[PDB]
Swiss-Prot record, chains A, B:
This is Pancreatic polypeptide. The keyword 4Fe-4S does not apply. The modification Tyrosine amide is found at Y36. PROSITE patterns: PANCREATIC_HORMONE_1, PANCREATIC_HORMONE_2. It comes from Meleagris gallopavo (Wild turkey). It is found in: Secreted. InterPro entries: Pancreatic_hormone-like (IPR001955), Pancreatic_hormone-like_CS (IPR020392). Coiled coil: none annotated.
C-alpha cells in the first residue's frame, strides 16, 4: 500500500526483485492515483 | 540494460521512483528473458 517496499541490496535475487516490482507497481498505482 | 538501477533511498520522489520502475522493468525484461 502507501509504504515504500524494502530493497535488499542491488545483488537481490531476480525473483525477490520481481516481488519488489509488484510491490512498487502497487505503491505507484496508489501514490500516483493510478494516473499512470 | 543488464545493470541494477540506482536506488536513491526510500524517500525518493515518486517521479524518479517511476524512473526506477522503468529501468527495473527493462532490467527484469532482460534478465528474465522476457518470460514475465
Amino acid at each position: 500500500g502507501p509504504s515504500q517496499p524494502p530493497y535488499p541490496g542491488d545483488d537481490a535475487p531476480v525473483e525477490d526483485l520481481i516481488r519488489f516490482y509488484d510491490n512498487l507497481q502497487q505503491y505507484l498505482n496508489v501514490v500516483t492515483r493510478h494516473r499512470y
